[PDB]
């Protein structure tokens, strides 16, 4: 995918907000800067917006560790 810095994830399922303090990110989407909130709700950019919301029922801190560095 695209292993980078910051705490990212890899949406396991699909969403459909697109822009509502939540996004329509689809499965495989990789959000950056994350942190559950008020329970099981995560934040982090994913497009022209910056830190909206994604269920802790719809995401997961990349179930695949390991990661290489660029240049």
Curated annotation (Swiss-Prot):
Top-level taxon of origin: Eukaryota
Domain SH3: 4-64
Subcellular compartments: Cell projection, Lamellipodium; Cell projection, Ruffle
Post-translational modification note: Tyrosine phosphorylated in response to signaling via activated FLT3, KIT and PDGFRA. Tyrosine phosphorylated by activated FGFR1, FGFR2, FGFR3 and FGFR4. Tyrosine phosphorylated by activated FLT1 and KDR. Tyrosine phosphorylated by activated PDGFRB. The receptor-mediated activation of PLCG1 involves its phosphorylation by tyrosine kinases, in response to ligation of a variety of growth factor receptors and immune system receptors. For instance, SYK phosphorylates and activates PLCG1 in response to ligation of the B-cell receptor. May be dephosphorylated by PTPRJ. Ubiquitinated by CBLB in activated T-cells.
Reported disease: Immune dysregulation, autoimmunity, and autoinflammation: An autosomal dominant disorder characterized by anemia and thrombocytopenia associated with circulating autoantibodies, positive Coombs test, immune dysregulation, and increased levels of proinflammatory cytokines.
SUBUNIT field: Interacts with AGAP2 via its SH3 domain. Interacts (via SH2 domain) with RET. Interacts with FLT1 (tyrosine-phosphorylated). Interacts (via SH2 domain) with FGFR1, FGFR2, FGFR3 and FGFR4 (phosphorylated). Interacts with LAT (phosphorylated) upon TCR activation. Interacts (via SH3 domain) with the Pro-rich domain of TNK1. Associates with BLNK, VAV1, GRB2 and NCK1 in a B-cell antigen receptor-dependent fashion. Interacts with CBLB in activated T-cells; which inhibits phosphorylation. Interacts with SHB. Interacts (via SH3 domain) with the Arg/Gly-rich-flanked Pro-rich domains of KHDRBS1/SAM68.
UniProt note: domains: The SH3 domain mediates interaction with CLNK. The SH3 domain also mediates interaction with RALGPS1.
Described purpose of this protein according to its UniProt entry: Mediates the production of the second messenger molecules diacylglycerol (DAG) and inositol 1,4,5-trisphosphate (IP3). Plays an important role in the regulation of intracellular signaling cascades. Becomes activated in response to ligand-mediated activation of receptor-type tyrosine kinases, such as PDGFRA, PDGFRB, EGFR, FGFR1, FGFR2, FGFR3 and FGFR4. Plays a role in actin reorganization and cell migration.
UniProt name for this protein: 1-phosphatidylinositol 4,5-bisphosphate phosphodiesterase gamma-1
Source species of the chain: Homo sapiens
Source organism phylogeny: Eukaryota, Metazoa, Chordata, Craniata, Vertebrata
Gene: PLCG1
């Amino acid at each position: 995918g695209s292993p980078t810095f910051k705490c990212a994830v890899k949406a396991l399922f699909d969403y459909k907000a697109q822009r509502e303090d939540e996004l329509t990110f689809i499965k495989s989407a990789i959000i950056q800067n994350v942190e559950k909130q008020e329970g099981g709700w995560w934040r982090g950019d994913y497009g022209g917006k910056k830190q909206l919301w994604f269920p802790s029922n719809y995401v997961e801190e990349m179930v695949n560790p390991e990661g290489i560095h660029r240049d």
